Amino acid sequence: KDRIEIFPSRMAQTIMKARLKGAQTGRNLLKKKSDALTLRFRQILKK
Amino acid sequence: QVWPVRQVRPVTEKLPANHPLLTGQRVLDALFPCVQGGTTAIPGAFGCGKTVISQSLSKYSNSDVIIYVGCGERGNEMSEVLRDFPELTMEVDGKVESIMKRTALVANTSNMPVAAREASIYTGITLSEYFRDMGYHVSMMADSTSRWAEALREISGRLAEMPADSGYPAYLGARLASFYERAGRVKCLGNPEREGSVSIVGAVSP
Amino acid sequence: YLSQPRLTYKTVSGVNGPLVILDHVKFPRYAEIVHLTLPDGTKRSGQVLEVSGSKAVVQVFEGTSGIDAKKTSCEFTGDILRTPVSEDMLGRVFNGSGKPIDRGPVVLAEDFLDIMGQPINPQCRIYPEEMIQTGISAIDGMNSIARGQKIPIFSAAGLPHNEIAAQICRQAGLVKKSYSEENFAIVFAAMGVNMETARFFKSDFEENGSMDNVCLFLNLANDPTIERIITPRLALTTAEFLAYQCEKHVLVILTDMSSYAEALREVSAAREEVPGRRGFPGYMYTDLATIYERAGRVEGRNGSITQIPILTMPNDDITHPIPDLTGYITEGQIYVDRQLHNRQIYPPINVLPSLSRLMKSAIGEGMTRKDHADVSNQLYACYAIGKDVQAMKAVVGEEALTSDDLLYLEFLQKFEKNFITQGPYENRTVYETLDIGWQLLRIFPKEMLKRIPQSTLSEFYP
Amino acid sequence: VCLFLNLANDPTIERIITPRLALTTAEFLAYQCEKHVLVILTDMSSYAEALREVSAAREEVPGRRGFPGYMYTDLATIYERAGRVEGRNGSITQIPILTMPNDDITHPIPDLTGYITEGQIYVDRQLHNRQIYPPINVLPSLSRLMKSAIGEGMTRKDHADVSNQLYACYAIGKDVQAMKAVVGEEALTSDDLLYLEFLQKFEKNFITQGPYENRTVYETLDIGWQLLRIFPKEMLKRIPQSTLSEFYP
Amino acid sequence: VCLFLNLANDPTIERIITPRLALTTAEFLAYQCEKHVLVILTDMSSYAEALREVSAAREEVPGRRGFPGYMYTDLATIYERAGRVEGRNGSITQIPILTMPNDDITHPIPDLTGYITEGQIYVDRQLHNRQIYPPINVLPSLSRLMKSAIGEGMTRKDHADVSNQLYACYAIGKDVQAMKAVVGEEALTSDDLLYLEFLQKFEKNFITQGPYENRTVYETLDIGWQLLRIFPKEMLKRIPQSTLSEFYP
Amino acid sequence: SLQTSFVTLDEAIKITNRRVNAIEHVIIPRIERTLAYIITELDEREREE
């Protein structure tokens, strides 16, 4: 399971590169959303 | 004298690393010490001021003789070095001595024949070994080991040799091991008793 | 010189592919040129490739079709390929081999030169100091080109790079400080190109009154490969003559060296050398180095040479050998992004991944202006922040934004509206670009200009 | 002490001959003098590199990563000279030391090492980053001879089952730690806390050891029992009940 | 039926001749007796292997993966023996079976067979793992039926449209299945649940079919219509309006 | 009203943090390993040729 099941080929490489970029961007946006929610969390907890 | 470049000059014996190497910089001197006769590496990507490290080494060091070496440096990038390096200054009893008579430069551009680029490193280590048998403390710096490596790879490809993992031929590890062990502190060979050593630092372009 | 008569042979041992085996040759030379005469009366030319014993093999540029085994003949120049060169070559066009394409006469040989060229003594190289005006806001303000800096451009296939090159050629020039622009010249070289984008060049460069300082070379795709490999060296040698033997500053432009690499693969396959990485000979690195490192200033001369080649990236792969090695032996790069082309922005330059290694010396107070570096750095940083803020808006919504975020978004929008877009003919001066940058900067309030020293802000912001 | 030296500056090709001479000496001492001999080789990676260089010069059929195809026979020849022989009190023990090119274990060198020897010890760079003097990863380090010198009469009755239970508990600990790395902390159960405590005490006491410390096997089993007592009696599914009654208190 | 039997224990060299020995008899029966023929071949991978044996023995320049270059022309030769012909009756229907090296669709043999045969039917390992007696993946499959099965004398008018709609629906269902593997069930809309439910019903009823269970074509189209009725009529975009009014209720 | 909103807020926060950790510590290492394996296999094919 530690290796995604796909035969080696150039287009496997391209597809995996694209998926890597998409996953990285999605992680960044999700971390941002968590940050904004935590900012609101702290702000309403001011008092 | 004439001495083959691929042969190690013999020595009477080898000695442990005892004396510490000094640099004017505080951080490198205090927390990550070097030794007289040690081996160091440092990245060499663009945008970092390793030229300042070169100047700090050349101005201020326990050593007395220095060798800058080159194996292809993108033309103008080492043209800057050739312009600015001879203008540097020292202090010896207040005398400027900006001639840098403690440095010898060996440089190569990209268009020089591959053999020259490959053999520049061995030329440098031969010269440092000679000036170490003189009886001094010597220091060497390499410009970019990766470019030497790809020059070696190209020379191998010219003769149509079996490529190893990631294309570079099998010589790499053994050659680097030999090259780096060529350094160290020793007692020189000769009737007047004396001693010397060879520090070394190298660059890596990941 | 040569005083002995030229020789002729008819011994043809055989043919294999584009090569021709001869025999019984007295002291053949390595790369000496020869001519061929088919029995039917056609003329041809070729270059000696390999030599062994009394045998000598020769490649033919125009192809080996129609060669007769016993009724052909050949002649030996007895010498290496030389070029006629002269300063009056401006206004002309050629086909790589030097044969004129337009209706002009043969070039008078003011001098003969060896096409292979020579290496340059590193001791004489002088650090580039000045900057070349290009008329493009992206290339001049956001980035820069020094007198000697070798800057390639990457661009995937099917994107408008020839247009960028043509506009650069049209609007090239020097900064007017107040031995003027007459010293500047251009050598344009296009290889392996369609018949379209060739008529376009030869017409448009004529339509804008600039042939007085241009020396142009064309080599269509259907031409012999040996013409393709030969041409760029010819261009470089004429550039060297015009720049160093005569005091000129020369801007060389090369297009699509990937086809040059293809021709290199061709000649390698002909010689039957074992391919390596991705079917490319290992020594192609040193070959490209030979085609490079013909730039920079030299002591004892007031001239300069500056190379700006273009490349076709296969499938947006930075780790492909061609762009990777080119980066290893060049001092920066300018990117072109597909999304910007889809956004109908005529200059599609994406200035974020691009970088020029010699900014610090190309500009300054004695140069265009003192505030230039500060303005450039501030513009880059705030654009990065603006892209980040658009990403922020992608989720957080417009109502959750601050005034600062609105400033960043508006600045970004106006920036691609004005700073990037130029038009196919708008020749902007450097001062004009800096003025536009200042106008865009004024949108932000005074305090946010963190990258701007206070004195410059007082001088220019009001 | 018998020493055979080879610095890196010596000719590469001589390294191919270097080990066989030492092995011949070991055989002589073992089977003509009844000397119990231990043998150590610093780096077979250099041997593999030199053999690769020779083969590349000889244009021989390549294999994985352009290595010579016949390392199997060669390495078997080098390592086979070990064990004991009937009617003689000599013996030979081999302890080579291998340097991986990097963290990978599927590189051909260790892969062909795996088939030969009846076990292997593993050293983990991560544990060395934790400043543990013997940074040993137990999990990838089985020994194929845990049968003929273990049990009552050799070391002690309750040895093998203790080893197996410790292996299982450590593996479960690694699994739950991986789960905690993602799910969080509040979602973990009591048994997970017990396993984490077991890991912490096991790494603090068992593997940790002085540069000169020398523990007997008996106290090692005592420490193992002390660690095992943390869990309840019923959770040790890897141990028979009789031993549990015999040694738990 | 006429059989030719070449077994694994026989010498491999005669495999080069065997298929032509079959096809010559086939074409004689198809063009000198006007008898319709269904000719079956199987495991062409062994035929390609025999070609590799011969090529390697003859030291010719290898192409892809040691296979000779002209084996493309060879396969063109061995597959171009079907189709009707005027002035006569009868024909040949060619159905080879192809054993698959690992599971790489992009292996040379399947690729070159893909450039010659008009279509291909695909057998999938996942379906066989999930216990489906005809484990066939519709997605990679394709044939040239666009002009054959229409309805004017063939099955019926709505046939091809129904088939295309089912194919599109299955593709979207697999897309939803991929979507569900990422996020939880909460993000599912009504459309996603509909698509998943359709996927299970289609897999469990349409494709699932025991041996000897002959099904009429009209019955298959009726089953497809039953599957289609699950979705409300608005989302069936491919269907022409007249057919939608006629058959959906 | 303040604390009632706060409840839903912290629940959404914990969910998002859990999702972030899940994306970070699972998918990316698998992708990197797959890419390395693919590069190795293509290198092997080229060497054999």
Curated annotation (Swiss-Prot), chain A:
Q: Where in the cell is it found?
A: Membrane; Cytoplasmic vesicle, Clathrin-coated vesicle membrane; Cytoplasm, Cytoskeleton, Microtubule organizing center, Centrosome; Cell projection, Cilium
- Which domain of life does the protein's organism represent? Eukaryota
What's its job? Answer: Subunit of the V1 complex of vacuolar(H+)-ATPase (V-ATPase), a multisubunit enzyme composed of a peripheral complex (V1) that hydrolyzes ATP and a membrane integral complex (V0) that translocates protons. V-ATPase is responsible for acidifying and maintaining the pH of intracellular compartments and in some cell types, is targeted to the plasma membrane, where it is responsible for acidifying the extracellular environment. May play a role in cilium biogenesis through regulation of the transport and the localization of proteins to the cilium.
- Binding partners and assembly: V-ATPase is a heteromultimeric enzyme made up of two complexes: the ATP-hydrolytic V1 complex and the proton translocation V0 complex. The V1 complex consists of three catalytic AB heterodimers that form a heterohexamer, three peripheral stalks each consisting of EG heterodimers, one central rotor including subunits D and F, and the regulatory subunits C and H. The proton translocation complex V0 consists of the proton transport subunit a, a ring of proteolipid subunits c9c'', rotary subunit d, subunits e and f, and the accessory subunits ATP6AP1/Ac45 and ATP6AP2/PRR. Interacts with SNX10.
Family membership: Belongs to the V-ATPase D subunit family.
Name of the molecule in the record: V-type proton ATPase subunit D
Query: Species name for this entry?
Result: Mus musculus (Mouse)
The gene for this chain is: Atp6v1d
UniProtKB/Swiss-Prot annotation, chain B:
Q: Which residues carry this modification: Phosphoserine?
A: 178
Q: How does it assemble?
A: V-ATPase is a heteromultimeric enzyme made up of two complexes: the ATP-hydrolytic V1 complex and the proton translocation V0 complex. The V1 complex consists of three catalytic AB heterodimers that form a heterohexamer, three peripheral stalks each consisting of EG heterodimers, one central rotor including subunits D and F, and the regulatory subunits C and H. The proton translocation complex V0 consists of the proton transport subunit a, a ring of proteolipid subunits c9c'', rotary subunit d, subunits e and f, and the accessory subunits ATP6AP1/Ac45 and ATP6AP2/PRR.
Q: Where in the cell is it found?
A: Cytoplasm; Cytoplasm, Cytosol; Cytoplasmic vesicle, Secretory vesicle; Cytoplasmic vesicle, Clathrin-coated vesicle membrane
Q: Which family does it belong to?
A: Belongs to the ATPase alpha/beta chains family.
- The record lists ATP as bound by 44-51
PTM remark = Phosphorylation at Ser-178 by AMPK down-regulates its enzyme activity.
Q: Could you tell me what this protein is called?
A: V-type proton ATPase catalytic subunit A
> Which species is listed as the source?
Mus musculus
Q: What does this protein do?
A: Catalytic subunit of the V1 complex of vacuolar(H+)-ATPase (V-ATPase), a multisubunit enzyme composed of a peripheral complex (V1) that hydrolyzes ATP and a membrane integral complex (V0) that translocates protons. V-ATPase is responsible for acidifying and maintaining the pH of intracellular compartments and in some cell types, is targeted to the plasma membrane, where it is responsible for acidifying the extracellular environment.
Q: What is the effect of changing residue 178 to A?
A: Significant loss in AMPK-mediated phosphorylation
From Swiss-Prot, chain C:
* Keyword entries, A-Z: ATP-binding, Cell membrane, Cytoplasm, Cytoplasmic vesicle, Hydrogen ion transport, Ion transport, Membrane, Nucleotide-binding, Synapse, Transport
Q: Which CDD domains match?
A: ATP-synt_V_A-type_beta_C, ATP-synt_V_A-type_beta_N, V_A-ATPase_B
Q: What Pfam families does the database record attribute to this sequence?
A: ATP-synt_ab, ATP-synt_ab_N, ATP-synt_VA_C
Disrupted-gene phenotype: Morpholino knockdown in the whole cochlea, especially in hair cells and spiral ganglion neurons causes a dose-dependent hearing loss.
| Predominant location | membrane
Quaternary form? Answer: V-ATPase is a heteromultimeric enzyme made up of two complexes: the ATP-hydrolytic V1 complex and the proton translocation V0 complex. The V1 complex consists of three catalytic AB heterodimers that form a heterohexamer, three peripheral stalks each consisting of EG heterodimers, one central rotor including subunits D and F, and the regulatory subunits C and H. The proton translocation complex V0 consists of the proton transport subunit a, a ring of proteolipid subunits c9c'', rotary subunit d, subunits e and f, and the accessory subunits ATP6AP1/Ac45 and ATP6AP2/PRR.
Protein name as it appears in the record: V-type proton ATPase subunit B, brain isoform
